[PDB]
Design a protein around this ligand. Structure first.
Ligand SMILES: C1CN(Cc2nc(C3CC3)no2)CCO1
Ligand SMILES: C1CN(Cc2nc(C3CC3)no2)CCO1
Lengths: 412, 412
């Protein structure tokens, strides 16, 4: 029968920090991680800024010899995973290594690497493609390389569900533990899509904010002057652990993961439905999975991408699910500060959701100067709000009409 | 406790045929689908051949306009999925659409699309990138587009576990049904990595057969003259269904999915351990999942990629798991005929395993002229072998040491 799942370790790279604590300090202080991109010439692009990881030192984690072989998304994924495992205090042994797995996901994985090897192929020919190109670029190699370095012989896999990837990765890893397929899972996601193909591709779809002259104000979820999402890089990893296994070894437990929902919109390849029907189905699945009265929800970390259609869909979904209680809970988008980490958005946001529970504080939606038509909930505009939070919900939506919800609550 | 999962529909594109029965006919006749790759200049490449899908007409499935938006891997995935759903006779209704989900995966996804947009990007800059570039290229758009086209509102996700994708997709879908998260899932994988970056990428790692003079002899699993895998394209989709749901509507049931195993080697990024300790744990895990003794297994559809290290690891793994029954089971690599469909390998091989149960026949390992040192099992050399098959295993082992086993059993 179904076992309980707790969070015993967390790790992160974000535009606000090279770990969880430094990232969280920025979240609570309403700091923006968004800046003109310096690694390349974006003068031909309609968007020239995003959320870069600043000062990442791969030699805190990996040999320069291994690092050279791996795309930044894999480097970021491993850094976050190592942080999480260290933070858990878990010791891997011959006694438990078959029961510890990994589910670290990505939207596109090694797009920089693919672009660079494409450049080689077109300018020089196939003989200049790296021998490390495939294992260094494909999405499942965070899971792969992590398992190799730590000796994890449990379930080893990777999700790719676009902007929903991190939430799905965490939820399904929890199910692995819940149903007895593993006792421990490292789960989350990593993204580094800030190359010509990523900024170009989202640019061609007009999905990105073009506020090049004021990048820290670009990401403004529910604000009437929003004009698309801000592209950001990084990684979130959590150590998920069966409750009795955590109690047995004396683990510090951050919070309990009580609920997971998925649903398909079955609406459109890229646009969410205006009424938030699929998002509402997903949150209800998750609240029923957690055995909760919806009025128990104190805080929602919204998907909150700063797109016109996405942001209003979410208000509509929240109003439909929570009715009058929609006015009592706090909902915020940390994407106001971090931008949109795509495959990693759900993973960093699950971590902010857990910290919202630890510190009893709703992070702000910065840049929310003029809430749009119908965006009349407590959206924690401008400044962090200390408040009672027993239950926190993290939403993600993505291309293909793919929805995820995670429900966390305090553990004592 | 757990619900029972059966297979009520199958769909396929392979190097042998544009559907399951035509592909299966090729398999039982020992036909090769491998040939020099056409309409692509491979002069500068060490490998010039592969398993291509021949005569695929996407307009049987999609309008020309919707096909132009989608990478070939997505087209192939949708073809297999639409075949599988039509094969099942399932009627999607408002009453059941929330209970029907999709998990169609890929190893890379849209390399061909990415390669052609790199061309535009380097030659002309970002302004020639298609607006449909991102949604037309990302791995979760087979699940996305299928869900939208058929109105499927159940769990909607995509796996990417390299050469293990198809096996994990089917296994995890089976779990969704077993634990009551869905009543029906369309599951499997698709792949089209026959571009410069795919042939070039694998070529640079020297992973491919370079037997350009005799492409149909290139794929020769456990033969002493094998020299790497053969890159192939295509798709497999299965309709997985809870047993009482299949029986209520009078579905034709091909077989029962009784077991699913996952394991990580935690060994090497691309090579398996020589003893196949990983594949052995995964098979043992799948038999335990099915409540079956190794003695009950009759037929194994091997990973059998025709790589020196992979083929011999699988022999060690089978001898270890099965002991004094290892010679009594038949084990064949259909990759001897199809080549390696990468993320789709496990999907088309699950279908071949199901059909082996229906037709009571072990497909051949063609080109097994001179079994290697230790390759003394019943590998079904050269020709199909009619026999008693009650239980069939399908193995997948991939980059990152990610392993998958499915266990199928006759139904009645
Ligand atoms: C999550 C982020 N993903 C990243 C991405 N992929 C692309 C191009 C190659 C298709 N540009 O950026 C897209 C899916 O959603
Ligand atoms: C099964 C196929 N996988 C996908 C793949 N990626 C590549 C090049 C871009 C790196 N070619 O194919 C890799 C291994 O798993």
């Amino acid at each position: 029968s179904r076992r309980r799942v707790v969070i015993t370790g967390m790790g992160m790279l974000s535009p606000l920090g090279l770990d969880v604590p430094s990232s969280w300090e920025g979240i609570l202080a309403g700091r923006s991680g968004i800046a003109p991109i310096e690694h390349m010439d974006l003068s031909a692009y309609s968007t020239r800024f995003g959320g870069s990881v600043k000062g990442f030192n791969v030699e805190e984690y990996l040999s320069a010899k291994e690092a050279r072989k791996l795309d930044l998304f894999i480097q970021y994924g491993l850094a976050a995973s190592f942080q999480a495992v260290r933070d858990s205090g878990l010791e891997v042994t011959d006694a438990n290594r078959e029961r510890i797995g990994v589910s670290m996901g990505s939207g596109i994985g090694g797009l920089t690497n693919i672009e660079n090897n494409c450049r080689s192929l077109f300018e020089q020919g196939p003989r200049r493609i790296s021998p490390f190109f495939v294992p260094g670029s494909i999405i499942n190699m965070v899971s792969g390389f992590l398992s190799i370095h730590l000796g994890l012989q449990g379930p080893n896999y990777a999700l790719t569900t676009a902007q929903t990837t991190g939430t799905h990765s965490i939820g399904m890893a929890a199910r692995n533990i819940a149903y007895g397929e593993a006792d421990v899972m490292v789960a989350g996601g990593s993204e580094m899509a800030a190359c010509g193909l990523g900024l170009g591709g989202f640019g061609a779809a007009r999905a990105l904010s073009t506020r090049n002259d004021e990048p820290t104000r670009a990401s403004r979820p529910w604000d009437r002057d929003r004009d698309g999402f801000v592209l950001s890089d990084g990684s979130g990893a959590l150590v998920l652990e069966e409750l009795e296994h955590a109690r047995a070894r004396g683990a510090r437990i951050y919070a309990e993961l009580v609920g997971f929902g998925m649903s398909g919109d079955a609406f459109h390849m890229t646009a969410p439905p205006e009424d938030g029907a699929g998002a509402a189905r997903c949150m209800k699945n998750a609240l029923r999975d957690a055995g909760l009265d919806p009025r128990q929800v104190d805080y929602i970390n919204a998907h909150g991408t700063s797109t016109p259609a996405g942001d209003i869909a979410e208000i509509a979904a929240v109003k439909s699910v929570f009715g009058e209680h929609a006015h009592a809970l706090s909902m915020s988008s940390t994407k106001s500060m971090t931008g949109h980490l795509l495959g990693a958005a759900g993973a960093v946001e699950a971590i902010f959701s857990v910290l919202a529970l630890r510190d009893q504080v709703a992070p702000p939606t910065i840049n929310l100067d003029n809430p749009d038509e119908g965006c009349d909930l407590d959206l924690v505009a401008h400044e962090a709000k200390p408040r009672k939070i027993d239950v926190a919900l993290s939403n993600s939506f993505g291309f293909g009409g793919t929805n995820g919800t995670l429900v966390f609550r305090r553990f004592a």
